[PDB]
Amino acid sequence: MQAKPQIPKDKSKVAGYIEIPDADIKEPVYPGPATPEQLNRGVSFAEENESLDDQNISIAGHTFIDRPNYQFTNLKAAKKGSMVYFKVGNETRKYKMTSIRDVKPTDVEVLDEQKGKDKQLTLITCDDYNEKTGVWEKRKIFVATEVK
Ligand SMILES: *[C@H](c1ccsc1)c1oc(CO)cc(=O)c1O
C-alpha cells in the first residue's frame, strides 16, 4: 500500500485488501506473478505485468481443501451486486460482479483483449481439482467491473 497504487518487487507485503461483505471476505491481496509460494499464503495476481493503475487486475483464487476459512472459500456465495471493495493503496475501489461465468484451462478465449471496460477485477477462482493431471477444471471467473 502506497501513493498511486502499484506493484513493487517485494512479493511479501500487501498491495491492497479484498473486501466482499457478501462473501464474508476481508482479506489481504498479495501482489505477485501467481508464483506458488504467493498462492500458498494468499491470493495473487495472474501476472506481474498488470497493475493497480491498469485496466486489467486479475486475482487468482487459490481454493484449498485443508483450510475451511480462508479468502476465496466463501466467494462462491457472491453474486452480481456483492459490492467488491478493493482497498488498494489508499482508495476504496468498488467493483460490481456484473459479468459472471466459469471457464476451463482449455478456454484460452476468455483471457484475451476484453477491452472496452473500466478497471475490471477478474476473480479467477479455480475450483474442482483434477488429480489425473494436477489441474483445476472449473475456473470460475467473476469479472467485477469498477462500478459507479
Ligand atoms: C487455476 C488455479 C488457481 C490456483 S492453482 C490453479 C488457474 O489460475 C490461473 C491464474 O489466474 C490460470 C489458470 O489457467 C488456472 O488454471
107 is in an annotated binding site: no
Q: Respond yes or no: is residue 97 known to be catalytic.
A: no
- Alpha-carbon gap, residue 97 to 146, rounded angstroms: 9
Catalytic residue, candidates 23, 30, 58, 62? 62
Residue 64 annotated among the catalytic residues of the structure: no
Ligand 1: list residues with CB < 6 Å: 34, 39, 46, 60, 62, 105, 124, 126, 136, 139
Test site for ligand 1: of 45, 104, 124, most ligand atoms within 8 A of the Cβ: 124
Query: What pairing do the DSSP bridges indicate for beta strands 120-130 and 135-146?
Result: antiparallel
Using alpha carbons, select from 9, 16, 47 the residue that is nearest to residue 30.
16
Domain boundaries, the chain: 1-148
78 in Cβ contact with 142 (< 8 Å): yes
Q: Using the mean position of ligand 1's atoms as its centre, give its distance from the Cα of residue 57 in Å.
A: 14
- CB atoms inside a 10 Å sphere around CB 80: 12
Q: If you write DSSP's letter for every residue of the chain in order, what string do you get?
A: --SS----S-SSS-SEEEEEGGGTEEEEEE-SSS-HHHHHHSEEES-SS--SSSSEEEEEEE--SS-SSSSTTSGGG--TT--EEEEETTEEEEEEEEEEEEE-TT--SSSS---SSSSEEEEEEEEEEETTTTEEEEEEEEEEEE--
- CB-based burial of residue 16 (10 Å sphere; 0-12 exposed, 13-18 middle, 19+ buried)? buried
Return the ligand 1 atom nearest residue 59 CA. Answer: 11
| Class for the domain spanning 1-148 | mainly beta
Distance CA 83, CA 81 (A): 5
Q: Confirm or deny that 128 is annotated as ligand binding.
A: no
